Amino acid sequence: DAGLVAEAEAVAAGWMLDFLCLSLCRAFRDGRSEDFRRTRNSAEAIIHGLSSLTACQLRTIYICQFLTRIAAGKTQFENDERITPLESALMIWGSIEKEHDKLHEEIQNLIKIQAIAVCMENGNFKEAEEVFERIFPFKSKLLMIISQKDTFHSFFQHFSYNHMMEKIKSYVNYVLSEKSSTFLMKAAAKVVESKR
Amino acid sequence: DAGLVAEAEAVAAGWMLDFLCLSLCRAFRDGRSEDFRRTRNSAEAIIHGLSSLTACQLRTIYICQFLTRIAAGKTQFENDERITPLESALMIWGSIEKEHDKLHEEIQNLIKIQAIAVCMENGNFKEAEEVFERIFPFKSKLLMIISQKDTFHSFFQHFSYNHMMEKIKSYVNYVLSEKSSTFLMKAAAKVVESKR
Numbered sequence: 001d002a003g004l005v006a007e008a009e010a011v012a013a014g015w016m017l018d019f020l021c022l023s024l025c026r027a028f029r030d031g032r033s034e035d036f037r038r039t040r041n042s043a044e045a046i047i048h049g050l051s052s053l054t055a056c057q058l059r060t061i062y063i064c065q066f067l068t069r070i071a072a073g074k075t076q077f078e079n080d081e082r083i084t085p086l087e088s089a090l091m092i093w094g095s096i097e098k099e100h101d102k103l104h105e106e107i108q109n110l111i112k113i114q115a116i117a118v119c120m121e122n123g124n125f126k127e128a129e130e131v132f133e134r135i136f137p138f139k140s141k142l143l144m145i146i147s148q149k150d151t152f153h154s155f156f157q158h159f160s161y162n163h164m165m166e167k168i169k170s171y172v173n174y175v176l177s178e179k180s181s182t183f184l185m186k187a188a189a190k191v192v193e194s195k196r
Numbered sequence: 197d198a199g200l201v202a203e204a205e206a207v208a209a210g211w212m213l214d215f216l217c218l219s220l221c222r223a224f225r226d227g228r229s230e231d232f233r234r235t236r237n238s239a240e241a242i243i244h245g246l247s248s249l250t251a252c253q254l255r256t257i258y259i260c261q262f263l264t265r266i267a268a269g270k271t272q273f274e275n276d277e278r279i280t281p282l283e284s285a286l287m288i289w290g291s292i293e294k295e296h297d298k299l300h301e302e303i304q305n306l307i308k309i310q311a312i313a314v315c316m317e318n319g320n321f322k323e324a325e326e327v328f329e330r331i332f333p334f335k336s337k338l339l340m341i342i343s344q345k346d347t348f349h350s351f352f353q354h355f356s357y358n359h360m361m362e363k364i365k366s367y368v369n370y371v372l373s374e375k376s377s378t379f380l381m382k383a384a385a386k387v388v389e390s391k392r
């Protein structure tokens with residue numbers, strides 16, 4: 001019966017999804033770019049094998065999508081979405097992990113500023129202004145900074161790329177702890193500990 | 197320790213590989229093209245997470261590669277390999293499942309003839325002759341058939357596409373039976389049977 005076989009494949013896809021999310025979180029925290037890139041490709045492919053997702057599975061795929069956009073922050077996509085990777089992460093973030101309001105607002109604001117600053121860092125001030133117009137007295141100060149190419153303004157040092165990465169890594173630690181007990185990781189660790 | 201974490205991820209990749217091979221075999225036997233295409237993409241991505249493979253894992257990836265080329269038989273690749281999909285499957289086949297010599301020779305010969313016949317079926321007789329020259333009295337008869345566009349010659353009806361698919365599907369049944377007891381499939385089926 002391919003009903004029973006199809007159901008077992010859906011159960012296994014769900015397990016593979018959690019395993020790849022946990023692996024993606026670890027690679028992001030560790031700074032292992034090539035590993036992150038490979039795990040991301042695997043998660044994206046496995047996600048195609050699922051056509052119906054539970055509330056928990058939706059949150060999992062969106063954390064994977066959010067981290068993928070954060071990792072591409074300083075890098076076709078702009079032709080399709082007409083926005084920068086960090087603007088996409090901001091849109092994804094706006095619908096996930098809202099219940100920790102304090103840290104959610106902190107991460108949101110760091111991404112908003114960095115979506116502008118990464119364009120300035122790359123020498124594209126016209127793009128930095130286009131990003132500002134899509135996201136946003138406070139605005140007049142931010143516009144003057146972009147106009148004057150004031151990349152190292154004190155505001156940008158408090159709302160830095162490193163600070164954005166640090167806050168996101170602290171959030172990643174909660175996801176990594178929450179998913180550390182998923183089926184495939186526990187079974188994988190039991191085999192490694194037995195050898196050993 | 198990322199040594200222990202990396203080892204658990206290697207164990208889990210090995211389990212995912214077997215699961216996706218078994219799923220690819222079933223989709224190939226069942227004729228589920230879209231499912232096969234999705235499982236193939238997932239297997240290819242998961243295979244990147246492995247850098248060292250055992251003898252059994254090598255045989256698994258090559259069955260996945262062989263079935264992928266067989267499925268693309270009638271469809272960039274020709275720019276890179278300078279050959280047709282069936283010629284690639286023939287090269288992969290030449291190094292796997294040799295110990296069943298009888299069925300191996302049968303599948304080999306059906307692919308050799310079909311690598312030529314699928315070009316004739318598509319109206320590309322110049323390509324059919326180029327395929328013949330790369331693969332191969334018997335040759336004079338095969339060359340005359342191509343020259344005269346004798347697509348429905350009695351030789352082609354014994355060495356048919358359907359006969360090639362049937363023999364390959366019988367081989368796929370041995371792989372499907374051999375891998376039906378792998379870790380992820382057995383655990384997936386236990387969860388489905390408990391619910392039901």
Ligand SMILES: Cc1ccccc1-n1cc(C(=O)O)nn1
Pocket residue numbers: 044045048064065066068069
């Ligand atoms: C849709 C999306 C949003 C954010 C980050 C990545 C992806 N994505 C999925 C895939 C795929 O399925 O290949 N590629 N890219």
Ligand SMILES: Cc1ccccc1-n1cc(C(=O)O)nn1
Pocket residue numbers: 108109110112113
């Ligand atoms: C990005 C930023 C930096 C510093 C202070 C405030 C803000 N900000 C908050 C909001 C909002 O809550 O919408 N928008 N912008």
Ligand SMILES: Cc1ccccc1-n1cc(C(=O)O)nn1
Pocket residue numbers: 240241244260261262264265
């Ligand atoms: C190398 C090969 C031989 C035969 C059939 C498929 C593949 N392949 C692997 C991949 C990948 O890793 O994406 N794509 N294609």
Ligand SMILES: Cc1ccccc1-n1cc(C(=O)O)nn1
Pocket residue numbers: 304305306308309
């Ligand atoms: C493809 C085919 C159809 C009919 C009879 C023989 C052959 N063949 C065998 C061989 C070989 O053993 O190399 N080559 N070609």
